Amino acid sequence: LATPSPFDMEKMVWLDVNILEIRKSVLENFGVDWSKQIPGPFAAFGKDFV
Amino acid sequence: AAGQNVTYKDYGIKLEFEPRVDDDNNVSMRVLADVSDIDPATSVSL
């Protein structure tokens, strides 16, 4: 004849979460940028024998 | 599919409540609480 409870009282849990992030960066661009591919010498010949 | 139907999306303040009570007036419940607003920064134009 005994009956159960409508529900059981559970235990409560507290959650504490921490997220930490640090970012650092450097960027350098120094100097002189010369050309590396340049035209060279040329030579041509032409003649009419007849 | 495809790449028409029109749907409506709720926004604002929304609550849902499902309580249960014991003989000692202990309350076991599930609660949803939502607060949302329209943000112009992330809106697209299509």
XYZ file of N, CA and C in Angstrom, chain A residues 1-38:
114
model
N 0.807 -1.209 0.000
C 0.000 0.000 0.000
C 0.844 1.264 0.000
N 2.149 1.144 0.216
C 3.025 2.304 0.192
C 3.146 2.856 -1.223
N 3.364 4.163 -1.311
C 3.454 4.852 -2.587
C 4.745 5.650 -2.655
N 5.281 5.859 -3.853
C 6.514 6.635 -3.992
C 6.240 8.133 -3.981
N 7.321 8.892 -3.855
C 7.256 10.338 -3.951
C 7.110 10.761 -5.408
N 6.568 11.957 -5.658
C 6.488 12.433 -7.050
C 7.843 12.520 -7.725
N 8.874 12.912 -6.983
C 10.231 12.979 -7.503
C 11.187 12.953 -6.321
N 12.462 12.739 -6.622
C 13.513 12.731 -5.616
C 14.283 14.040 -5.680
N 14.509 14.650 -4.521
C 15.291 15.878 -4.459
C 16.759 15.545 -4.686
N 17.284 15.935 -5.842
C 18.684 15.713 -6.151
C 19.552 16.788 -5.506
N 20.861 16.615 -5.639
C 21.818 17.593 -5.155
C 22.138 18.589 -6.261
N 22.358 19.837 -5.872
C 22.669 20.903 -6.811
C 24.175 21.091 -6.896
N 24.667 21.324 -8.109
C 26.092 21.475 -8.371
C 26.331 22.841 -8.993
N 27.297 23.572 -8.451
C 27.738 24.841 -9.008
C 29.005 24.615 -9.819
N 29.056 25.194 -11.014
C 30.209 25.068 -11.894
C 30.801 26.442 -12.164
N 32.101 26.579 -11.925
C 32.844 27.800 -12.208
C 33.902 27.483 -13.255
N 33.874 28.211 -14.367
C 34.756 27.964 -15.503
C 35.506 29.249 -15.818
N 36.813 29.132 -16.040
C 37.655 30.268 -16.389
C 38.422 29.957 -17.664
N 38.390 30.886 -18.616
C 39.133 30.770 -19.866
C 39.992 32.018 -20.014
N 41.301 31.826 -20.153
C 42.251 32.923 -20.262
C 43.105 32.737 -21.506
N 43.329 33.824 -22.238
C 44.137 33.770 -23.447
C 44.893 35.078 -23.624
N 46.157 34.974 -24.033
C 47.001 36.125 -24.333
C 47.695 35.880 -25.665
N 47.667 36.879 -26.543
C 48.325 36.817 -27.840
C 49.272 37.996 -28.001
N 50.457 37.724 -28.541
C 51.431 38.758 -28.853
C 52.051 38.455 -30.206
N 52.471 39.505 -30.907
C 53.034 39.325 -32.238
C 53.923 40.507 -32.588
N 54.901 40.249 -33.459
C 55.775 41.276 -34.008
C 55.809 41.109 -35.520
N 56.122 42.202 -36.210
C 56.221 42.188 -37.665
C 57.257 43.215 -38.091
N 58.272 42.769 -38.827
C 59.352 43.629 -39.287
C 59.549 43.459 -40.785
N 59.850 44.564 -41.465
C 60.125 44.537 -42.899
C 61.057 45.706 -43.199
N 62.354 45.423 -43.296
C 63.351 46.468 -43.464
C 64.409 46.025 -44.462
N 64.942 46.993 -45.205
C 66.015 46.778 -46.149
C 65.718 47.424 -47.483
N 66.542 47.095 -48.473
C 66.402 47.595 -49.835
C 66.200 46.405 -50.760
N 65.181 46.483 -51.607
C 64.792 45.384 -52.489
C 65.135 45.768 -53.925
N 66.244 45.238 -54.431
C 66.719 45.546 -55.770
C 66.113 44.599 -56.804
N 66.264 44.972 -58.072
C 65.903 44.089 -59.170
C 66.897 42.939 -59.274
N 66.394 41.768 -59.667
C 67.222 40.576 -59.773
C 67.260 39.982 -61.171
N 66.542 40.561 -62.132
C 66.504 40.050 -63.499
C 66.457 41.243 -64.441
N 67.520 41.439 -65.213
C 67.649 42.623 -66.060
C 68.029 42.182 -67.466
